[PDB]
Amino acid sequence: SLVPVYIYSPEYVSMCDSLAKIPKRASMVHSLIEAYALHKQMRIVKPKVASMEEMATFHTDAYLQHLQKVSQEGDDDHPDSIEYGLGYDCPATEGIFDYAAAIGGATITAAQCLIDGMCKVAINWSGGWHHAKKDEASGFCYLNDAVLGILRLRRKFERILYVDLDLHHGDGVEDAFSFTSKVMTVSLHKFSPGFFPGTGDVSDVGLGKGRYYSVNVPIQDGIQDEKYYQICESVLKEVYQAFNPKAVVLQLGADTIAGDPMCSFNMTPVGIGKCLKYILQWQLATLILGGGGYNLANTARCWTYLTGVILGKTLSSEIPDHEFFTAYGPDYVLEITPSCRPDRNEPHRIQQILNYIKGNLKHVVI
Ligand SMILES: Cn1cc(C(=O)Cc2ccccc2)cc1/C=C/C(=O)NO
Ligand SMILES: [K+]
């Protein structure tokens, strides 16, 4: 149809809530999307928990298995943990395996729907776990659903484009497809000394026949909706022309929005929204994902607003009373206001980058 597919299931939302770093976030988001009763304008779909075999299409058995053990326990001692990433920035708590599988399945489902012509846009705000390596958790990413969806997607579509708008660089997803030309990865993110993962400069382009098939736009603190769109809509224009994608997987981690603990970018869901609109306009099959977002209230407002955009709907400022109303204090409005920090993004260095890029995107043609 022309109607968007909204991957959802009360079981699933509960599952996602159990994640340490972002408790009750999944619920808060569905709850708010429901309060603006947008779900009514979408096609709900239950997540087909990823099979051991499906997850294994990108992750080593050794890893998936170890992730399983620990999940049915508590990583009792296991000094081998570090070998797989389980530690602090990826706590191997109990029953996370089911957690992973739940999410990875959802994203896979989303991709299935897109494949089966059931819709042009499939959503899974829980997904977006872009750091997970083929065999080693990373920055709260125990499973890389982002990649899985791309794989499942490549079944029907030839060239697939992955646009990562999370605050952090989408290393995991990028690596997975660093050596191929069938999948292109575009990532906007804060790049600085010490800032995790600290990978993906602009000189990062890919390897072998995957060279120039990995584009990275390093941004600096303070960037707002103004410049961000300029920068983004600029790159996405080139990428589109020189790549001609068949489908698109878009990660929209809200850890870039003003107010997020990450205190780096100074974006508001409206800006990210404009980027979303620009992509959607290509009317290719598109798989939407969540990801970072740690100022929960805000993360909810953001993704809800975006969901609105996806429906070409205009939401009212008044935050609809709902299960978490209290949380949107003290103004209870949808809009987010950019903090008052300077935008350390020198316009010279920027244009310098947008050329470096389009220049590399020149080869992609040739
Ligand atoms: C909150 N978080 C902490 C880490 C680290 O492991 C390390 C770190 C080290 C020095 C400065 C800042 C962060 C990674 C994340 C989030 C990733 C994310 O949301 N991906 O989508
Ligand atoms: K990113």
Ligand SMILES: [K+]
């Ligand atoms: K690539």
Ligand SMILES: [Zn+2]
């Ligand atoms: Zn272990």
Ligand SMILES: [Zn+2]
């Ligand atoms: Zn992030």
